[PDB]
From a paper:
A deazaflavin-dependent nitroreductase (Ddn) from Mycobacterium tuberculosis catalyzes the reduction of nitroimidazoles such as PA-824, resulting in intracellular release of lethal reactive nitrogen species. The N-terminal 30 residues of Ddn are functionally important but are flexible or access multiple conformations, preventing structural characterization of the full-length, enzymatically active enzyme. The split barrel-like fold is characterized by a central six-stranded antiparallel β barrel in a Greek key topology with four α helices: A at the N terminus (the putative helix removed for Ddn structure determination), B after an extended loop between strands β3 and β4, and C and D between strands β5 and β6. The identification of these residues and the lack of classic catalytic residues in the active site suggest that Ddn functions primarily by precisely orienting PA-824 for efficient direct hydride transfer from F420 and potentially through additional transition-state stabilization.
Cocrystals of the NΔ40 construct with oxidized F420 were also obtained in two space groups and were solved by molecular replacement (Holo-1 in C2 at 2.1 Å resolution and Holo-2 in P21 at 1.8 Å resolution, with an rmsd for one chain of 0.3 Å over 109 aligned Cα atoms). Although the F420 preparation included larger polyglutamate tail species, only two glutamates could be visualized (F420-2), consistent with the structure of FGD1 crystallized with a similar preparation (Bashiri et al., 2008) and the recent observation that F420-2 and F420-5 bind with similar affinity to Ddn (Gurumurthy et al., 2012). The crystal packing combined with crystallographic symmetry operations reveals the same decameric ring structure in both structures, with five monomers in the ASU of Holo-1 and ten in Holo-2 (two rings per ASU). Although the decamer structure includes extensive intersubunit packing, its relevance to the native quaternary structure and function remains unknown because of the difficulties of studying the full-length enzyme. In structures Holo-1 and Holo-2, F420 binds to a groove on the surface of Ddn through a series of hydrogen bonds and several salt bridges between positive charges on Ddn and the negatively charged phosphate and tail of the coenzyme. The last visible glutamate of the F420 tail lies near the β1-β2 hairpin within hydrogen-bonding range of the side chains of R54, T56, and R60 as well as the main chain of K55 and T56. The more proximal glutamate H bonds with the side chain of N91 from helix B. The phosphate of F420 sits near the complementary positive charge of K79 and H bonds to the amides of M87 and W88 from the loop after strand β3. The deazaflavin ring system is stabilized by H bonds with the main chain of A76 and K79 and the side chain of Y133 (helix D). Additionally, there are waters in both costructures that mediate interactions between protein and coenzyme.
Author numbering: 43 to 151
The structure:
Amino acid sequence: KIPVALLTTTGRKTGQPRVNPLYFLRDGGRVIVAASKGGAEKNPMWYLNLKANPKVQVQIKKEVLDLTARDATDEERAEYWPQLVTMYPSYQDYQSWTDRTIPIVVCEP
Ligand SMILES: C[C@H](OP(=O)(O)OC[C@@H](O)[C@@H](O)[C@@H](O)Cn1c2nc(=O)[nH]c(=O)c-2cc2ccc(O)cc21)C(=O)N[C@@H](CCC(=O)N[C@@H](CCC(=O)O)C(=O)O)C(=O)O
């Protein structure tokens, strides 16, 4: 239905690789994900991990991409958020129900 990307982050405490499935957009070499965690009030751990260890790896089907993750800028959110919402409308609910602003993470070559 919606394909997932596998995001590997380095544990910001343990240093161990952690892998999580996420929905994604691809734009010009970038992989974009949202740290929505089903509308939970706290950011997911993988987001905390990539804040401490920006080098991540993303696997989409066969491709294994070595990327550097960062938060979307305001202008990027305005471009990507509607695309994410179009793809998976629940994102908009999750954003409504959560106090924190749901991070949009841009992973770049
Ligand atoms: C529960 C925790 O996961 P998390 O990193 O908080 O991520 C929560 C969710 O985002 C994650 O489960 C997503 O995969 C859920 N999820 C999506 N989550 C999203 O946020 N966005 C999505 O688009 C998304 C899509 C999706 C599709 C299918 C599916 O099955 C799940 C999907 C986890 O895996 N904990 C591990 C590892 C935790 C970890 O990374 N530890 C760090 C320390 C972290 C710290 O305490 O600071 C370390 O090793 O050093 C553990 O405790 O054993």
